[PDB]
Structure formats: structure tokens, C-alpha cells
Amino acid sequence: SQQTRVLQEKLRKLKEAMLCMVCCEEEINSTFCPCGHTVCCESCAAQLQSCPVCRSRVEHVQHVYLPTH
Amino acid sequence: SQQTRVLQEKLRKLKEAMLCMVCCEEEINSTFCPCGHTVCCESCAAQLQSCPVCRSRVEHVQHVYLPTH
Ligand SMILES: Cn1ccnc1-c1noc(C2CCC2)n1
Ligand SMILES: [Zn+2]
Ligand SMILES: [Zn+2]
Numbered sequence: 430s431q432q433t434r435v436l437q438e439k440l441r442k443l444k445e446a447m448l449c450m451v452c453c454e455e456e457i458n459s460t461f462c463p464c465g466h467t468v469c470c471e472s473c474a475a476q477l478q479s480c481p482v483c484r485s486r487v488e489h490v491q492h493v494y495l496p497t498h
Numbered sequence: 499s500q501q502t503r504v505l506q507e508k509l510r511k512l513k514e515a516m517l518c519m520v521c522c523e524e525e526i527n528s529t530f531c532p533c534g535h536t537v538c539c540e541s542c543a544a545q546l547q548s549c550p551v552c553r554s555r556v557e558h559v560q561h562v563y564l565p566t567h
């Protein structure tokens with residue numbers, strides 16, 4: 430039905446929101462510290478000096494294990 | 499159709515995976531450091547001296563800004 434199509438759309442959008450903002454291909458699993466933006470995979474996060482969202486300096490990257498992984 | 503029911507179940511399971519494993523009521527937004535388990539809301543994470551997933555000592559809690567929030 431049309432309702433099946435609407436639910437398919439919500440699932441797709443939620444899954445897309447879990448992908449790296451830089452490469453769009455790998456799941457987010459890294460946090461820029463201390464700001465806390467968790468928007469990248471480990472490969473894309475490794476080389477950024479400043480947060481791509483808020484421009485704060487990245488002191489380090491913390492790996493995160495999310496239940497959605 | 500039955501497919502609408504199946505998609506409703508996938509969306510429910512994905513949304514449940516975003517809720518605190520301790521209180522089951524608030525969104526996950528906190529990471530236990532240094533282990534990296536990100537399974538609690540800020541209120542439950544502030545009360546645990548040990549990680550509920552791996553039992554490593556919590557040195558500190560890092561707030562995470564996720565795109566799914
Ligand atoms: C593979 N590994 C090693 C240590 N921890 C993990 C792990 N994987 O997924 C998870 C999530 C946290 C809630 C379940 N943890
Ligand atoms: Zn990436
Ligand atoms: Zn930031």
C-alpha cells in the first residue's frame with residue numbers, strides 16, 4: 430500500500446543519517462573531542478584538524494560502539 | 499499488507515536501538531570513556547562508575563551530538 434512506501438522512506442532516511450558526512454559510504458563510529466560531534470567514519474575523522482560541523486579544534490578522536498552498528 | 503507490518507517492526511527495532519539501555523526512555527547521547535560504549539542517556543551515564551557493557555572503569559562521560567538526535 431501507500432503506507433508501505435511511507436515506512437520504506439522513513440527507514441531509508443534514518444539509515445542515511447547514520448552514514449559519514451564526508452564519504453557517505455561508511456557508518457559513523459567516531460567522535461571529535463572535546464566538542465562531541467559524531468558525524469564521521471574513522472578514516473575521514475583521522476585527518477581533520479577542526480570539527481567540520483562547529484570548527485572547534487580536534488584534540489583527539491574517540492571511537493564509539495553504537496547499538497545501531 | 500503483511501509488508502507494512504514487517505516495516506513497522508524494523509522501524510520500531512531501529513528506534514529502540516537509539517534508546518538508553520538502562521532507563522529505556524531517553525535517547526542515547528553519552529559515551530563512556532575510554533572504552534567507547536555509547537549506550538546511555540546523560541542521566542544514567544552520570545550514575546555508572548563502570549561500563550554496563552564491558553565493565554571497564556568510566557574515567558569520564560563524553561556528550562555526543564549525533565545526526566539521528
Ligand atoms: C565488537 N565490540 C568490541 C567491544 N564492543 C564491541 C561492540 N560491538 O557493538 C557494541 C554495542 C554497544 C552496545 C552493543 N559493542
Ligand atoms: Zn567517511
Ligand atoms: Zn564540533
Ligand SMILES: [Zn+2]
Pocket residue numbers: 518519520521522523524538539540541542543
Ligand atoms: Zn537512561
Ligand SMILES: [Zn+2]
Pocket residue numbers: 530533534535549550551552553554
Ligand atoms: Zn565499555
